[PDB]
Amino acid sequence: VNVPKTRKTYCKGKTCRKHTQHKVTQYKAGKASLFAQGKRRYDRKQSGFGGQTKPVFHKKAKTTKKVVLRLECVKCKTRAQLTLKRCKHFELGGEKKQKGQAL
Amino acid sequence: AMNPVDHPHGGGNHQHIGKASTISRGAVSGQKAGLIAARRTGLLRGSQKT
RNA sequence: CACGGACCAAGGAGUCUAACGUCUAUGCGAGUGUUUGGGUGUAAAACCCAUACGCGUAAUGAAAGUGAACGUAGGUUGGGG
RNA sequence: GUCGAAUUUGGGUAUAGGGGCGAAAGACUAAUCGAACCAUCUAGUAGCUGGUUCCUGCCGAAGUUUCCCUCAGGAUAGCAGAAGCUCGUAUCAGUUUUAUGAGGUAAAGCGAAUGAUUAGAGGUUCCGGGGUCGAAAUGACCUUGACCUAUUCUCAAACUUU
RNA sequence: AGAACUGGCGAUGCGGGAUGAACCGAACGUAGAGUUAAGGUGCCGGAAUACACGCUCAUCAGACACCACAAAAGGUGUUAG
RNA sequence: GUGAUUUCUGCCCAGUGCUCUGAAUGUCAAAGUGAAGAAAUUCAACCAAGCGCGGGUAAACGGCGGGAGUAACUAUGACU
RNA sequence: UUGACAUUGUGAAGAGACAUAGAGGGCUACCUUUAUAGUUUC
RNA sequence: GAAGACAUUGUCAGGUGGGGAGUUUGGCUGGGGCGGCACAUCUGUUAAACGAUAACGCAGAUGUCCUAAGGGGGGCUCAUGGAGAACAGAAAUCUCCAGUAGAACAAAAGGGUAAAAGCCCCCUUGAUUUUGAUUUUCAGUGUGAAUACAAACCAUGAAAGUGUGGCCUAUCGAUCCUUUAGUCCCUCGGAAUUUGAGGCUAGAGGUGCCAGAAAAGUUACCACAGGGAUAACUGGCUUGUGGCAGUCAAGCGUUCAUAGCGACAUUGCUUUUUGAUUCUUCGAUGUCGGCUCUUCCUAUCAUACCGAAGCAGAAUUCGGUAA
RNA sequence: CGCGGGGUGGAGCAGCCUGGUAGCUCGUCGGGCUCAUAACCCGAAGGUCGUCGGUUCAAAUCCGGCCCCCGCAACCA
Ligand SMILES: [Zn+2]
């Protein structure tokens, strides 16, 4: 879809508590780390013998994901999140639809 | 002319190899039946070319 | 014209255990439970016993924690006696 | 059929179970082979089949809901019994009456909307197609097509005023 | 084959439909008397070869719901319009 | 693999295999090396075999199909 | 099958990178670079 | 003697690895397979005027799309018909009259909507934040969707008010894990500090068999527990189809409907075709055909006796009693 | 999925690294050549250089994102 590059939501910053500007950026998950209890438990569980020990998911059915608009307040830097409806093509770059022009 | 339990080449509604009979060096005992490690095959056309 | 049964005798299949729910009966009651163990014995019984210990009397929070009366322990309504 | 040899056979010996041996049939390996036999694990597991033992009395069902790799199974609600508990004729009822609502089925309707559908009648084309009089005309005449008006015959589960 | 409402069989005998899980009647402790249901009353077979008005003769008659089949089309057969 | 003798064994290495050069800003493990760190650690370059790339091979496993234009009756196509 | 470490010691040539010096290009960073009193891998 | 600190031997790591090992290889279903999705869903109808309600019943639709097609406000009125204007005609643009929606409002369809919910212009993010209640499906669980509120921060408009996504009914996702935002709080339990980690509240990564295992074939070498809950014989219900038979009479038959035929229709019968079904039988009723032998039926090929002819005779055709 | 490359007339390859005018082969046409036919030569057209943006005196080219394809490796919801 198409969303602006600036967005004005109610803020929760314990000093703002009002409408302040925010900066929108489509959310990327983030590099998975070790040293989280799930990974370390997985490593010991995989090690040795026994083959695979946890399921691996093969019957994928969906073709989209949910685009996450994470917001950054320009006054107090308190970052917030919102979730969108499923879509195929999303892009932050905002160009506005014109109706007078032809197709 | 065998049964699949008895040989790689056995089985099938017709007498045939099914897969390539040219077998690799790294093949294991049980898989090495046929033309071991062949560089070429067919009919010997040409000289030794050694 | 679905299955078992030719006949007879004898055997033959919802039990025991650890932990539990409801109901019931019994005792004592903010307590409760002698029998791990100790004493004793007519001796695997019967009888007696401390310290402990579990459950209840306090719960709510992941937690660090905090912790049960404004009042005749409230008002209104219905209530057996 | 073969019958002087890829011949027949005794004794010895070697080869042991996912192993042997196989001129190849999954054949043979002690009447056992597409994985021998013996004991043990082992009362192996079965949503499936079969059976499941004395009498009388009282009560008395279900094949239906939702979820489940769910469809010969379970869980769950319901139907049933038992124990009762608090009260003592009432905040009751597979019923009627009165008053007030709701509904779009049966019927009905198409000279009402939508859709379908029979027949002619009357009109208009600067603007349908043709034949006649015309060099042509927004000239005229006859016919066919649609168009309009007032009618006419027959209809609808996904049409309808009522 | 699949549904709706209700009643049933399953789980249920008894009288009746000859016979039958489902129809009709009626639901059941052990007996006696009386009266009935549905069905019946020539004989089998308990009960009128009852009474009354008509119709039908069939050289394949007809004879009681569920239910155990018969149609279009025809007949100076016969009856009534 | 085929199955005496006789005779002949045609075309196809794209695919699956097999096998060879390694002339490599391709990929790539453990170790080892460097940077940041207070360390656990993170990052980065580098890097064997193998794969990938490029040759050979069908008496390896196998495969041997369409379409268009054409010859002076048509039809058909030696030709393209 | 391939690599690494250990078994596992004793030396020279060529190549690769660091700390002493250095001619030519950008007070003082680097390349064409060359012998090391020294450290390092093929 | 050869090789030589390389082989070899030991451990770890990457590739290869049906030689071998273990395992898996949906469901519904007029039997299974193929097909399809009736599996998660949505509109109209079946549906029998509350609700509910089945079929692999009927016509379809969904895994999306939209920074506006979301929110607020203002102005205007649509489709179409008629009459007119240079090029300009049936379709360009312009004017008027008529015009209850006969247009449009993303898609499927049904409701709804006209000084709007339609078309154009202006401003903005109310598609925001905090947790509760409630409707639907229902177990009065979850999920999705929605309703009306309460406490903040705003948008628009003069203001009243409206605004918690899309005019409504579909448009979607638990546990564990990982990861992000927030709280910068609790814990790391002999005492401290700092990284690291674990906790707390709200999101994301997804299970389409959609209340959500991690999963390829073959068996004609086969096995077991069962099923007549389920197919392939017979039998039973049915008779489309098969076969046979009627009624009517436009016509053929030179002429003439009916000697013999007979269109368009229509009414039946049979169970000697094949279907449809799934009642019996899967702790088994021996599934082709022929041979042999008996008996039964009539819808009669011959033989008996007859009726009719487009029957001169001959031959033949139609029909009756007759197995 | 982590890294990496490619997209140029109707079809197929050079030109990318060089930042400076887009070349060649087949196809189409016209002209030339031969007394003709064929063949052979020459010229016209043919690639928004996949799309958008940035950098530069200047971008098909270098870089970022997107569409498609390809290579190795990886993958506990
Ligand atoms: Zn703020």
For residue A69, how many C-alpha atoms fall within 13 Å in the half-sphere facing its CB? 21
Query: Which nucleotide is closest to A59, CA to C1'?
Result: H207
Which position has the token pair 């608009």?
Answer: A69
Kindly report each contact of residues B39-47 with a partner whose C-beta sits within 8 Å and lies 24 or more positions away, as own/partner: none
Who among residues 9-68 of A has its Cβ near strand H, under 7 Å? 9-10, 12-14, 17-19, 27, 29-33, 35-39, 42, 51-66, 68
Method: cryo-EM
The data reach a resolution, in angstroms, of 2.5
* Run of H or E residues at A45: helix A37-46
* Run of H or E residues at B50: none
> Rounded distance, CA A66 to CA A85, Å?
6
